[PDB]
Amino acid sequence: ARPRVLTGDRPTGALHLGHLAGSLQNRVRLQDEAELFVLLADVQALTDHFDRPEQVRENVLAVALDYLAAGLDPQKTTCVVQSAVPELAELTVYFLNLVTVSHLRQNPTVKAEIAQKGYGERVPAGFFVYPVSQAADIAAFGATLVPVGDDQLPMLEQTREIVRRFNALYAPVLAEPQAQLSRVPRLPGLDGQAKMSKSLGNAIALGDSADEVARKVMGMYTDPGHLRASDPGRVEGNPVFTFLDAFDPDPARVQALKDQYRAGGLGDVKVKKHLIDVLNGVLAPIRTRRAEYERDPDAVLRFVTEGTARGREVAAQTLGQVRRAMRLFGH
C-alpha cells in the first residue's frame, strides 16, 4: 500500500473471462503491493447508456459481486460508486476548459468507438468528452498509477496533459499519473472473434456454472481447415489455444498439446476437454465465493457503501485544494 492505483469498470453487464485475464487477475495482485481503488463508473456508463438507466443501476451491484468473486479483498480494495461522489462531476467541468474540441476529436480510441457505434456525427456530447471525466476520476482520487492497455493509453495520456495544464495554470496541486502498461493481448471470443462480449454472444461469465463453462468450451471455434482428429490443425487464430496460454498453469502441457495438434490425431475434443479442466481450476474458487456472497447480500453492499465513503472523502480533499488553487470565490 504505497502508490495509489486507480482502476474501474463501467457497470453495463456481468464480468467475463476476458476481464479476468485482461484486468482482474492483475488487480488481485495490485491490492497487496499498492492501495487499490476500483471505480464502478455508472456515470460514464451513462454517456451511451443514458437510455437504459435501469441496466446501469442493476449492474453496479452485479459487477461488485464480480470483483469480490474474482478475489478482490474488501479489506484491501476501495470500491467506489462514481454516482455517489459529485466531486468528480465538479472536476470534469473545470477540466473541460483545459482541453480543445479539436484534441478531443483526435483521441483514436474514442474515435474508434464512435466508429463501431455507428453514431456518425450524432455523437452524444457526454460521450465525446468522457476522456476528461476520466481524467477527473484519476486526479480527484489522487492516483499515481493506472493500469492500462494500449487502447486506453490515449485516455491516460490526455489525463497527463490535463493535470500538467492544471498545475501550470493554477498551482501544482494534482499528481501526474503514470501508466502500468498492458496485460498482454486481449482474450478473444468463443467463436474466435477479436473481442469477447456478452453483446456478441461469445462470452463465458464469471458466474457461469461449471456445466455451462463446459458447454461453451465444447462449442468453441477452432480451425476451419481441421475437419477430423487425424487431420493436422492450426494453433494460431484458434481460441482454444489462446485461452490456454492465458489460464493454463503449466505451459509444458500447453506446448505439448500444441505439438500433437499440428501433428495430427489430436482432435478438438481432447484439447477442449483439457481446457475445461484448466478453466474449472481457475473458475471454481471464483464460483464458490460468488455463491457465498449471494447468501450475504449485505456483505456486498458493505463493500461498496464503504469504499464509496472513503472515495468520497478523498475526492473531497482534492477538490479542496483544487478550489483554492483556482482561486474560486470563497477559497
Q: 183-202: which residues touch ligand HRP (CB under 6 A)?
A: none
Q: How far is the CB of 316 from its own copies (least distance, A)?
A: 11
Q: Smaller CB distance to its own copies: residue 233 or 307?
A: 307
The Cα–Cα gap between 282 and 71 comes to 12
First to last CA, the chain: 32
| Grid coordinates given for 79 | 470500491
CA distances from 204 to 15, 139, 207 (A): 9, 34, 8
CB-wise, 28 or 257, nearer to ligand HRP? 28
- Least Cα distance to 276 among 198, 319, 195, 219 occurs for 219
Of the candidate spans 1-9, 67-75, 199-207, 227-235, the one that interacts with ligand HRP by CB under 6 A turns out to be: 1-9
Give me the least distance between CB of 123 and its own copies, in Å please: 5
User: Is residue 163 near ligand HRP by the rule CB under 6 A?
Assistant: no
Q: For residue 27, which of 61, 81, 72, 65 has the smallest C-alpha distance?
A: 72
Provide the mask over 28-67, with x wherever binding to ligand HRP is found by CB under 6 A and - wherever it is not: -------------x--x-----------------------
Cell numbers representing residue 144 in the block: 499515481
Q: Which residues contact 32 (CB under 8 A, 6 or more apart)?
A: 76
| 137 part of the interface to ligand HRP, by CB under 6 A | yes
Looking at residues 223 to 242 of the shown chain, list those that interact with ligand HRP (rule: CB under 6 A).
none
The dihedrals phi and psi of 196, each to the nearest 5 degrees, come to -95, 120
Residue 96 near residue 129, CB atoms below 8 Å = yes
Q: Does 158 bind ligand HRP (CB under 6 A)?
A: no
Strand order in the sheet with 178-181: 77-81, 35-40, 4-9, 145-148, 178-181
Helices 108-117 and 153-169 meet at what angle, rounded to 10? 130
Q: Which of 57, 228, 262, 270 binds its own copies (CB under 8 A)?
A: 57
Give backbone dihedrals phi and psi of 3, rounded to 5 degrees, phi first. -75, 150
What residue type is assigned to position 11 of the chain?
P
Q: Which residue has the cell 469498470?
A: 9
Of 4-12, 224-232, 283-291, 312-320, the window that binds ligand HRP (rule: CB under 6 A) is 4-12
Nearer to ligand HRP, 137 or 248 (CB): 137
The answer to the question of residue 134 lying near ligand HRP (CB under 6 A) is: yes
Query: Within positions 161 to 180, which residues make up the interface with its own copies, using CB under 8 A?
Result: 169-170
198 is in an annotated binding site: yes
Nearest approach, Cβ of 317 to its own copies (angstroms)? 15
C-alpha neighbours within 13 Å on the C-beta side of residue 42: 23
Indicate which single residue of 70, 84, 206, 246 sits in contact with its own copies (rule: CB under 8 A): 84
Binding site for ligand HRP (CB under 6 A): 6-10, 41, 44, 134, 137-138, 146-147
Binding-site annotation: residue ranges: 198
Binding site for its own copies (CB under 8 A): 40, 42-43, 46-48, 50-51, 53-54, 56-57, 60-61, 81, 83-84, 86-87, 89-90, 92-94, 96-102, 104, 121-129, 132-133, 169-170, 323, 326-330
